[PDB]
């Protein structure tokens, strides 16, 4: 039948998860636990096993088929992703589950280390019991975020995943830490008025008491994403500053943090820094899990780069092959370059609704300073002494006098750097025609030397950690 | 030899004198039996009219297909089709190696003429595969390559030129090398890398005597346009102007020769009006360039460079007259060009100095180091991120 074919792969899924739990339980093996847990296992569990072969009715077959309700409720947790009490909360195509025929296979392998017989479910006290429970939830959450489940299922995730846990450990908190972040993205997507932020805050207190590196990193990045949606600026600003955000973090974590920090910085008139992190973020983000947030980074970033006075290329639009969705941003790119306001104001209002979703709209209005700035910027840098009159004819500014105030303000900001001599009336470039007399070639090299040294210190410590973890746990 | 066809395509691409070439272009598919194929070659021409055919319009300047062009095509495919079948039958009778590959080429030509481009490419691979000498394999690649160059579809051209070059030493197919040199230069112009074309073409003339490929004289003329565009004067000076190639031909060179003479004389009013002349006669006569915008940027930046290189100061009037291009234009181009640092200059318009920061100074060597250096940090970060987890 249909669940028999995918049965081979369920034993495979169980092999990787069971081991992962095992590792965690013996002291601090933390580094090896987080790489396994996130993009690597997940890309396989969902896509290869369930979707590709077909049969998504192997997910609540995986976390139940014994009839475990667990000593602290998690029976519901398993239902809601798939097979609510009917055939499919998305895709069924299963003739055996725990509400169709109990048992057909054991991914549970008759030992508490993912799942185990009903004897655990009704009551246990074992030290294997928290370890299976935290783990139980990671396995479930994997289909939730990929398939983009919604509704009530989304609302009840939070309850089971935290306020059943307020005591964990470092091993357990790490697993839970990953589960909360995936649910949080699924939550964000629906654009429900029911507070995403509130749960994520409650989860933070538990993260902090165990003092688990992982818990702080995951929650914090999501908490910023939540904050942007509501559009309550002050809290996110403080929260970003508090995040130390560890150097030993998963790839998806790295791309998402830089991305949030960029959104926050862009409105602020810290656009030079915002644009670098946002460009980086797109590259760093994967091909599979990342896709919802990923879209949003490329759309926002095009506006953010303009804010610095960068003129973004056509290759940028064509190459990921999203050019259609990007088409309006493309229009802003043209408008910024020309130096004339009329085209920029018109586009801002017309696409206004579409921009607001992505969270661009607050950044779009800031470009009005930038429309003129980007055009005066090319002209001031290129030439030496040029008249305000040249700037105004080319750019289509109102007056040379108008153009004179505008250049003055920019040199104060210092992203065009010049000194104006309104005698004859030219704007003058800064330039020394030798930078060897100045420290600047040395200072440039020296900065690299600090940046380089950081890589050496990071590498020596990181290198031994996974083989060490493997030694205690025993390797074949 | 089919290099003439590429010269027909090219002149309409920039919309100036298109009219006469359009007609000449149309005549070539009658001979071949290329009706369908023509629409594909037409694509390469883009940024001008090429749409009218007997199977389409008759309104625009590009020439109508004849009733005869169509009929000839019907004949040619029937005949090709007859050859293919006939060639196999002869193959059973005698040697396997030579005869069978000739048969597969018949099949590719047949599909290529009706317009089944995909079909032609699978057949063409078959040809390549079949056991014959390496020398013979090369002969089969040169036809598809020329056809590839016509459409200016990048993929086809890459494959052929690249394998063709390998074979030369290994087989010992030095005799084929002559056709191949010219073919390498065609590839080289075809990508937006005019830089490669300038070194490649100059070599091509000396090693070439003859072996089934376009005239000696034609190349020399073509060598001058690539040489100038890419090369700055000290390189240019040694190679072409002192070198043999350009002098021996003598005649048929005046547009290009006027450029070199003016550049020697170093009167920039004279050089700039000859830039324009060599752009209209020579440069537009090539279809080549997957983005034309790159070709235009390189000719302007080169001429500009020469003028700026010779002088740390010029008055604005001398510089502005010398270019002959507008205040609006000079400025508009200058902003893009300066970034590169091939020019590395700035305009003091109100005192009237055209100053040059110098592209030979410390300021330059710095601009490059910093520009490369910063991007490398971003990169160490992307690599580093994957490795930890």
């Amino acid at each position: 039948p249909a669940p028999q074919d995918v049965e081979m792969k369920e034993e495979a899924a169980a092999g990787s998860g069971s081991a992962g739990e095992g590792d965690g339980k013996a002291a601090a093996t933390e580094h090896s636990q987080r790489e396994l847990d996130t993009v690597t296992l997940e890309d396989i569990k969902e896509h290869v096993r369930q979707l590709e072969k077909a049969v998504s009715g192997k997910e609540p077959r995986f976390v139940l088929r014994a009839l475990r309700m667990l000593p602290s409720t998690s029976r519901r947790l398993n239902h809601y992703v798939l097979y609510k009490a009917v055939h499919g909360f998305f895709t069924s195509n299963n003739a055996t589950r725990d509400f169709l025929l109990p048992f057909l296979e054991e991914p549970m392998d008759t030992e508490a280390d993912l799942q185990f017989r009903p004897r655990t479910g009704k009551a246990a006290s074992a030290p294997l019991l928290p370890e299976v429970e935290a783990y139980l939830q990671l396995l479930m959450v994997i289909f939730l975020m990929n398939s983009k489940r919604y509704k009530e299922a989304q609302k009840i995730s939070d309850d089971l995943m935290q306020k059943i846990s307020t005591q964990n450990r470092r091993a357990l908190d790490l697993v839970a830490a990953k589960c909360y972040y995936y649910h949080a993205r699924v939550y964000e997507f629906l654009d429900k008025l029911d507070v995403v932020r509130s749960f994520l805050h409650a989860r933070l207190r538990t993260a902090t008491l165990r003092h688990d590196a992982d818990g702080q990193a995951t929650l914090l990045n999501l908490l910023l994403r939540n904050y942007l949606h509501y559009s309550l600026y002050d809290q996110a600003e403080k929260l970003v500053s508090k995040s130390v955000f560890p150097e030993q973090a998963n790839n998806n974590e790295w791309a998402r943090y830089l991305y949030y920090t960029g959104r926050i910085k862009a409105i602020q008139l810290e656009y030079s820094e915002a644009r670098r992190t946002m460009t980086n973020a797109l590259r760093k983000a994967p091909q599979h899990t990342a896709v919802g947030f990923k879209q949003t980074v490329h759309k926002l970033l095009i506006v953010v780069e303009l804010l610095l006075g960068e003129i973004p290329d056509r290759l940028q639009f064509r190459q990921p092959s999203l050019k259609r969705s990007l088409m309006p941003y493309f229009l802003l790119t043209q408008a910024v370059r020309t130096g004339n306001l009329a085209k920029f104001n018109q586009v801002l209002d017309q696409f206004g609704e579409k921009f607001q979703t992505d969270g661009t709209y607050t950044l779009i209005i800031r470009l009005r300073h930038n429309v003129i700035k980007t055009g005066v910027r090319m002209i001031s840098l290129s030439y030496s002494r040029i008249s305000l009159a040249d700037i105004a004819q080319k750019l289509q500014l109102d007056s040379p006098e108008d153009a004179e105030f505008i250049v003055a303000k920019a040199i104060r900001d210092g992203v065009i750097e010049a000194s104006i001599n309104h005698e004859k009336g030219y704007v003058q470039s800064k330039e020394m025609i030798d930078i060897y007399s100045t420290r600047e070639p040395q200072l440039a090299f020296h900065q690299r030397i600090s940046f380089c040294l950081d890589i050496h210190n990071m590498s020596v410590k990181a290198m031994r950690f996974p083989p060490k973890s493997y030694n205690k746990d025993l390797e074949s | 030899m089919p290099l003439e066809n590429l010269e027909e395509e090219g002149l309409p691409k920039n919309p100036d004198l298109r009219i006469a070439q359009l007609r000449f272009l149309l005549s070539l598919p009658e001979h071949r039996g290329d009706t369908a194929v023509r629409e594909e070659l037409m694509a390469a021409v883009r940024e001008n009219n090429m749409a009218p055919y007997y199977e389409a319009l008759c309104k625009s300047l590009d020439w109508q297909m004849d009733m005869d062009l169509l009929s000839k095509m019907k004949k040619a495919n029937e005949e090709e089709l007859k050859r293919l079948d006939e060639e196999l039958e002869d193959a059973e009778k005698n040697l396997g190696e030579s005869e069978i590959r000739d048969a597969m080429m018949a099949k590719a030509e047949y599909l290529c003429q009706i317009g089944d481009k995909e079909g032609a490419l699978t057949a063409f691979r078959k040809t390549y595969d079949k056991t014959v000498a390496l020398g013979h394999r090369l002969d089969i690649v040169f036809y598809l390559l020329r056809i590839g160059l016509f459409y200016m579809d990048n993929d086809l051209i890459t494959r052929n030129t690249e394998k063709a070059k390998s074979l030369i030493e290994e087989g010992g197919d030095w005799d084929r090398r002559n056709r191949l040199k010219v073919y390498q230069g065609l590839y080289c112009v075809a990508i937006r890398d005019f830089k490669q074309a300038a070194e490649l073409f100059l070599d091509t003339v000396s090693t070439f005597t003859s072996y089934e490929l376009m005239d000696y004289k034609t190349f020399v003329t073509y060598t001058v346009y690539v040489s100038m565009i890419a090369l700055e004067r000290p390189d240019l000076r040694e190679k072409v102007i002192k070198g043999a190639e350009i002098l021996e031909v003598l005649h048929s060179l005046p547009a290009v020769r006027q450029y070199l003479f003016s550049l020697y004389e170093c009167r920039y009013s004279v050089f700039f009006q000859s830039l324009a002349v060599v752009e209209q006669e020579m440069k537009k006569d090539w279809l080549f360039a997957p983005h034309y915008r790159y070709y235009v940027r390189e000719m302007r930046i080169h001429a500009y460079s020469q003028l700026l290189e010779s002088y740390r100061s010029l008055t604005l009037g001398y510089m502005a007259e010398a270019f002959g291009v507008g205040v609006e234009f000079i400025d508009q181009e200058l902003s893009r060009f300066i970034a590169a640092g091939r020019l590395h200059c700035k305009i003091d318009k109100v005192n009237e100095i055209v100053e040059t920061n110098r592209p030979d100074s410390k300021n330059w060597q710095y601009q490059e180091t910093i520009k490369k250096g910063d991007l490398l940090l971003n990169r160490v970060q992307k690599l580093s991120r994957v490795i930890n987890m």
Binding site: R314 | N14, E279, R293, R297, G317, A320, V325, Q332
Partner: peptide, 24 residues
């Protein structure tokens, strides 16, 4: 985005012949 130089080609050739006389 797209280079303004292309649009410049047709305009720049013609300018040259007139300009030299017009301005010194």
């Amino acid at each position: 985005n797209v280079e303004d130089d292309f649009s410049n080609q047709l305009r720049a050739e013609l300018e040259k012949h007139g300009y030299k006389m017009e301005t010194s």
